[PDB]
């Protein structure tokens, strides 16, 4: 269950670290996203990319809400 949750925080940072949601500036932003915070939160963040980058940065590019993404999750 808590891939739902990482996906809904990981969203959230991404549409506030770049400008405009493109492949380029959404992929960007993913290889940074994971080293801001404390340990427990990096590794957490690093294994939900792992597995579900592409559909976060697809679901970004499109304009989808976080719910939106993070649907197939729930």
């Given at each position: 269950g808590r891939d739902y949750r990482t996906c809904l925080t990981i969203v959230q940072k991404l549409k506030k670290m770049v400008d405009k949601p493109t492949q380029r500036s959404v992929s960007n932003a993913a290889t940074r996203?994971?080293?801001?915070?404390?340990s427990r939160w990096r590794d957490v963040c690093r294994n939900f990319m792992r597995r579900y980058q592409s559909r976060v940065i697809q679901g970004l590019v499109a304009g989808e809400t976080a719910q939106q993404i993070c649907e197939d999750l729930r």
């Amino acid at each position: 269950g808590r891939d739902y949750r990482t996906c809904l925080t990981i969203v959230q940072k991404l549409k506030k670290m770049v400008d405009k949601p493109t492949q380029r500036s959404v992929s960007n932003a993913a290889t940074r996203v994971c080293r801001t915070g404390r340990s427990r939160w990096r590794d957490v963040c690093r294994n939900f990319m792992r597995r579900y980058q592409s559909r976060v940065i697809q679901g970004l590019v499109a304009g989808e809400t976080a719910q939106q993404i993070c649907e197939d999750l729930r």
